[PDB]
Subunit: 123 residues, 4 copies
């Protein structure tokens, strides 16, 4: 439905690269490359999207996760993005995210960053 | 590593049921059943976890997504949980979550709920 | 310090109006008018800011609260904005916010919206 | 209304101390002492609460801010708590919070922590 609209290469305001395939079943698969933080090269992502969204002009809800471990680095952390895809000439994925680091129990109060990323099809 | 510790059936404070398998590669697969909201029965989830966490007593970072569409209902929304697994006698997964609904652009300011769920191996 | 830079009239991307005075002591006082939601006219706000920020080019941390009760309406809710003031030609206050509604205990999981507002000195 | 219920000394799960007065007009004034982080002794807080909440068993919405500057320390950061007061034998204030640090523009993606604190009248 928005399978075609979501599948592809997206870029956020930080210059990160989100490469995703949307499956007919609601699956999101792909790779993420962050332009910032304790990260290098590509990381696996997986997520889900609403494969039968409302037809009233609403966006398409979706989310995905990256664990920041690959063959190069392990930042002992994971980010989830929660948001919606908005189609059209200037298609966008508007997200908020939560980045949790593994911590000791004494430090768990400072485990989680929150922010917002907007992805577009052009950098 | 925490593959065995994470795999299984978890319950949160709302009485929701999180059934997950942790793969050797960092994958999370399974099903979620919410005790609240516009939800019935099981929904697909997918996520990621740190398969090689720190050995200094830190938790294990992880996250997952549910899109709230199944064969019974479609709530045009997705939730992502971001958190850490803490092993031991009283193992826990401590999370914060973001629930994004598909909205019109005019309503996007009110698209996203935030909360926190704690999962245990016993209800 | 940024007392002069913060004091004044600010506008966000929704067309809301934030009127604030920064005190020498770190106080924020003023009024908020939301262009959206269950709101009309001005609401009291109060908050705090860092009156002696770092001199290394960092922003100035601040926050404020609105309870959505005035002489016209009571939305049984409160929003807090947490963010930083960035000075200069295009001064900005970049925030994330939490909007909590009063709920029953059974509904408390869906009590809190999260979002992000960027304020500028020009609409 | 909940003026009497809110006014007083509260303690969270970290062992922090929140001392507040609720004014008839919806004002919150007081001091905060954090048991964790870059903090020592008391800090000024100000906030707002719904002075005429619903009478249907709903909680009372409120929020407050601390800027982490006092005569002893300056952590160049501010926290806002957004939540609701629930009255009764085991009265509670259930909150989520946003802690923003002043950062450079390049580091603003990692400026804001999110968490949740529950306050009770007994430690």
């Amino acid at each position: 439905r928005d399978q075609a609209g979501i599948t592809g290469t997206w870029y956020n305001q930080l210059g990160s690269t989100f490469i995703v395939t949307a499956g007919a079943d609601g699956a999101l698969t792909g790779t993420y490359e962050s332009a910032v933080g304790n990260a290098e090269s590509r990381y696996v992502l997986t997520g889900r999207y609403d494969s039968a969204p409302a037809t009233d002009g609403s966006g398409t809800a979706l989310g995905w996760t990256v664990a920041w471990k690959n063959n190069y680095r392990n930042a002992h952390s994971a980010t989830t993005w929660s948001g919606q895809y908005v189609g059209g000439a200037e298609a966008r994925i508007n997200t908020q995210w939560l980045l949790t680091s593994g911590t000791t129990e004494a430090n768990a109060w400072k485990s989680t960053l929150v922010g917002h990323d907007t992805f577009t099809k052009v950098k």
